[PDB]
Write a protein that binds this ligand. Structure first.
Ligand code: NAD
Ligand code: NAD
Lengths: 319, 320
């Protein structure tokens, strides 16, 4: 198994690149992104890290000819909040990079994973335990580009036999990457605020529940789906979930683990109208039955690990 | 009176729509455009307000919009379902990129913009009988895929920027003015030609494959009416519409009534069959009916009468 990763230096890529390196060995894994890893970044100095802009189809093909992958994880995308503000970049990146990856997957017989997202759903999905097949009316361009990713991948599978595999990831929580202005990124902010003992200004409303998953469960699942025999897969795109929580549910969790009250004021920002159009929870029975998707962390296990790791990885005050 | 721009105008839909808009609103208020120039027997040859514009040329597309200042736009170019399976790269280039440019232009210059979708946007999980406006969409062609994209992108432009994006999922459209090509629903137009010529029709769709269809006069009344409707009457951006549903053998019987003779039709399955089979047999268009008055005058025999009489006149095929 020779594994190419594109968009490999962001939140998912960082940890997935290390996980795959450890399992199949550094010589069987090639990691690429349009930027280079910074000095403090976990993949710096390592070899088998390349620069590739996936918008350059010929460059893309060049790397694939040379490395001869049997597997590819295609991760570059502009996500829900950023996309609303830079839609042109969203459409370019999410539509065209994906187009080229699937064309290379067809031509060089690569098994290709491209993640979708709960942002592919909108307010007609059926908000409670959303099924794998339902109405898709996303309210963000990111979401729109991901419905397209899903349909087009599945068409490549039917038409050419391309082994296209995908999951709808819930919001993903990890320690290793600092927090942005993204929709589910408030969770990652509250951990940091609690460690610094500062005011958390949470843009998502206190009782807005969302499906979420902690990264080690995400890594197990992204490898497991791709190791599975094709024969076992009754579909190309699967909901997976970890657990649903609201920001008040997260604040509690963090208080139980720090034995100290933390400071949260809830003032809505752009993430709230977005999150509200998403499902509260997913039905992932198909992923469970077909290829063994499973979850070992609950919200309190995750907080304990997050409150330990953040001080180690970014020097915030330990607990 | 609106100022209407039509892109993709020389094709099957464009030809008859362009003429209708010219009649109704004045030739002065209608600009139409296409990547090629019209050939001399084309109904739009020799007419004013007919330009050459490649919609993949964003700069060029913008320049014409700037000069003309439309208030409405019908953005028609696409690669359709049978051709798209064979030329997928072209389908994705046309169907995605021109659409993107159109919407940006609609936003930027305040255009009410119509972009047709299709029954081909549905697949075999849609609910095959009397399919709803809102249902599972799992199209089994790249065209279908790009049209789901078009539906959702346009909708997002309505929500995010206030763009008055409007659309319908057209069924198989039947018209006489345009010579039939290789597409799925076009077996129907060929069968009218084979009958006037008294030649074999080798049909690549299987005889009992029912599909939603509509006759051009009705589709024209609907295309104009959806665009005249005031925005507050529209409960949604994308509407199903149909005329009536028929299979190849139904169409053959209907031609045989009018000709009072037998046609020869042999069924040899082609690539149109699998595609067509994944589409709805019929659609629920109640929302379109209630919201903006979508209505239908022709049935299959009114349609055959008119096709068999019109094709000779328009194209010199043997009469009656
Ligand atoms: N993190 C989440 O909570 C989450 C949730 C659901 C789905 N996903 C999906 O997982 C994938 C990865 O998400 P992430 O959280 O790692 O995002 P991220 O923004 O953290 O990482 C994205 C990486 O893509 C790179 N990139 C941008 N343009 C590129 C280009 N033209 N060529 C090559 N690389 C380019 C960026 O430099 C960055 O390293 C995306 O498709 C995303 O939609 C993520
Ligand atoms: N005809 C049907 O039964 C049917 C059904 C459903 C939806 N539609 C939609 O209606 C639209 C028009 O269909 P049609 O049947 O008239 O198609 P057609 O193929 O007959 O006509 C297409 C026209 O678009 C033009 N074109 C191609 N590339 C172009 C470009 N880059 N810039 C400008 N023009 C370009 C072609 O020259 C042609 O004149 C399509 O979006 C189609 O999906 C048609």
């Amino acid at each position: 198994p020779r594994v190419l990763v594109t968009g490999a230096l962001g939140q998912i890529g960082t940890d997935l690149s290390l996980a795959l390196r450890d399992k199949f060995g550094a010589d069987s894994v090639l990691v690429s992104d349009v930027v280079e890893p910074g000095a403090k970044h976990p993949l710096a100095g390592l070899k088998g890290v390349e620069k590739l802009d996936c918008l350059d189809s010929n460059g893309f093909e060049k790397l694939v000819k040379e490395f001869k992958p049997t597997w590819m994880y295609h991760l570059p995308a502009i996500m829900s909040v950023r996309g609303e503000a830079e839609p042109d970049l969203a459409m370019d990146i999410n539509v065209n990079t994906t187009r080229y990856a699937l064309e290379l997957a067809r031509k060089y017989n690569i098994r290709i994973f491209i993640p979708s997202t709960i942002a592919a759903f909108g307010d007609k999905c059926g908000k409670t335990m959303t099924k794998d097949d339902t109405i898709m009316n996303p309210s963000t361009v990111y979401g729109v580009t991901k419905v397209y990713t899903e349909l087009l991948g599945t068409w490549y599978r039917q038409k050419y036999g391309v082994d296209f595999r995908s999951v709808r990831l819930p919001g993903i929580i990890s320690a290793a990457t600092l927090p942005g202005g993204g929709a589910t990124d408030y969770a990652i902010h509250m951990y940091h605020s609690a460690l610094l003992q500062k005011k958390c200004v949470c843009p998502v409303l206190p009782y807005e529940s969302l499906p979420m998953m902690y990264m080690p469960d995400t890594l197990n699942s992204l490898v497991k789906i791709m190791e599975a025999p094709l024969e076992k897969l009754t579909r190309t795109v699967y909901n997976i979930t970890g657990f649903s929580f609201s920001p008040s549910e997260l604040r509690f969790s963090i208080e139980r683990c720090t034995d100290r009250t933390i400071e949260v004021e809830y003032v809505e920002g752009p993430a709230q109208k977005i999150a509200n159009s998403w499902p509260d929870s997913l039905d992932d029975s198909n992923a469970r039955n077909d290829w063994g998707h499973q979850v070992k962390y609950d919200i309190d296990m995750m907080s304990e690990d997050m409150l330990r790791q953040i001080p180690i990885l970014h020097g915030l005050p330990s607990l």
